[PDB]
């Protein structure tokens, strides 16, 4: 087309609000105050192509997983209305997170004001994905113990809301605060250690280990840590500047970790419901 023509630009000619990662030397979309140009660029090759498509495809995938889960036979669950509500909250959190992410990455180059609005939605979505993922997990883990289940839901929701509020602060979106962002969101996911200790103290090592909670929880903690480390450190583009502009830079790998992380988490809580089904609702 001969409408809204553009060429990628080197990192040095970018305005300030577009200078996120100076290890990405070329292939940047120039500032373009057109939503038409921004959404057309999804089919173009630039520094944001992989970021858009990993969470655009991840978003539809979780939306198909969420719809299909909603229509599963009611016989398969001990309490289908309640169980579908808890999973529904997880799917909702995953879909809002992935949707805000792919939209923000698409309209990032629009203007300073649009970029500022969508970066706050992008950050807020991570917290929503984390808050939502605790709901089915605390539900099956504290199935017979209602007082800790209720308390830990207040805590993850209160910590999540504080992360959403901190995400509104304009300093938080600056490149200097990259490590602060990794720390805030990592802390939020790692705060799951508190209800995990409570579960292990209440039920013991054999129970925590027999049910695959322990193996699955270690993997989740691993995905969080390596995912946060890649993001904070800008690995591997730090080691090959100008060689990862389009493919496999840190943000792109991190996006992959979020989708994988959300699927492994779904798999873990899905096994907990199958186990709760085998033993029934008896306490």
């Amino acid at each position: 087309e001969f409408e809204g023509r553009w060429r990628v630009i080197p990192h040095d000619v970018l305005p300030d609000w577009l200078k996120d990662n100076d290890f990405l030397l070329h292939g940047h979309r120039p500032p373009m105050p057109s939503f038409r140009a921004c959404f057309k660029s999804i089919f173009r090759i630039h520094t944001e192509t992989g970021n858009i498509w990993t969470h655009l495809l991840g978003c539809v995938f979780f939306l198909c997983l969420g719809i299909f889960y909603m229509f599963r036979p009611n016989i398969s669950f001990v309490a289908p209305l309640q169980e579908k509500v808890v999973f529904g909250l997880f799917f909702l959190g995953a879909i809002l997170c992935l949707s805000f992410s792919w939209l923000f990455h698409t309209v990032y180059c629009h203007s300073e004001g649009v970029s500022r609005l969508f970066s706050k939605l992008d950050y807020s979505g991570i917290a929503l994905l984390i808050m939502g993922s605790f709901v089915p997990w605390l539900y099956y883990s504290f199935y017979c113990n209602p007082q800790p289940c209720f308390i830990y839901l207040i805590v993850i929701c209160v910590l999540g809301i504080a992360a959403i509020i901190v995400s509104q602060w304009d300093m938080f979106a600056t490149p200097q605060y990259r490590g602060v962002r990794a720390g805030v969101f990592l802390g939020l996911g790692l705060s799951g250690i508190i209800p995990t200790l409570h579960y292990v103290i209440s039920e013991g090592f054999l129970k925590a280990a027999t049910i695959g909670q322990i193996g699955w929880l270690m993997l989740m903690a691993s995905l969080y840590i390596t995912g946060a480390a890649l993001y904070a450190a800008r690995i591997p583009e730090r080691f090959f500047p100008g060689k990862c502009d389009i493919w496999f830079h840190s943000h792109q790998l991190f996006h992959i970790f979020v989708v994988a992380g959300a699927f492994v988490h779904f798999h873990g809580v899905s096994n907990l419901q199958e186990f709760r089904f085998m033993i029934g609702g008896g306490c």
Partner: single-chain antibody
């Protein structure tokens, strides 16, 4: 540090051909597209076309498809423009202007004057007002109307007499580097404005708007501003 240095003036006879040089420095030559602009004496700016030094591809305004030919010399970071079968209508100042991703022009050459003498043997941009005179300290507003939606792909330029234009505002509201805060751009769709708060003696000159949404790129007729 970015400079675009053009070849000297040319006095040629009808039917001849001229090649204008544009030597680019202070950046990686292939990284940005180069555009060519014509300005007839006492007239508005006209877009000739654009050239991509990397791909070697060019897009011409249909009006000049048979008049201009763009070439490059990647080694010497130079763009060329051949003008053929010259007539009296071709008497003008020709500029090379550099893009930065989208076709708003942050960098311009000094211009090459081509004089044709025999002595020796599409989006319309409507600018308003066409001219105005105001005192120092006052506020002025120049408007720009486009015949079609240009999706905020608009730039404002100031041109002093005998000089090349210089960008003030791009992407409808983005103040260009080094430009005073007195200048502000606004608008959306088809309607745009350039506001000059607290007029200064250096603010006299011609003002032009430019759309870079659709090819061929076009300029408004200009607003001549005089300071009392």
């Amino acid at each position: 540090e970015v400079l675009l240095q053009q070849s000297g003036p040319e006095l040629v006879k009808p039917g001849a051909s001229v090649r204008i040089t544009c030597k680019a420095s202070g950046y990686t030559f292939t990284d940005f597209n180069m555009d060519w602009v014509k300005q007839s004496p006492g007239k508005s700016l006209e877009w000739i076309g654009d050239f991509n030094p990397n791909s070697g591809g060019s897009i011409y305004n249909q009006k000049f498809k048979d008049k201009a030919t763009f070439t490059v010399d990647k080694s010497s970071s130079t763009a060329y423009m051949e003008l053929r079968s010259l007539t009296f209508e071709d008497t003008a100042v020709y500029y090379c202007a550099r893009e930065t991703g989208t076709a708003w022009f942050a960098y311009w050459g000094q211009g090459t004057l081509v004089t044709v003498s025999a002595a020796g043997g599409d989006i319309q941009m409507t600018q308003s007002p066409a001219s105005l005179s105001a005192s120092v300290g006052e506020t002025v507003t120049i408007t720009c109307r486009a015949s079609g939606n240009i999706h905020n792909f608009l730039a404002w330029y100031q041109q002093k007499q005998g000089k090349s234009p210089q960008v003030l505002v791009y992407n409808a509201k983005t103040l260009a580097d080094g430009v005073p805060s007195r200048f502000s751009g606004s608008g959306s769709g088809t309607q745009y404005s350039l506001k000059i708060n607290s007029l200064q003696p250096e603010d006299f000159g011609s003002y032009y708007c430019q759309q870079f949404w659709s090819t061929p790129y076009t300029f408004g007729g200009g607003t001549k501003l005089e300071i009392n």
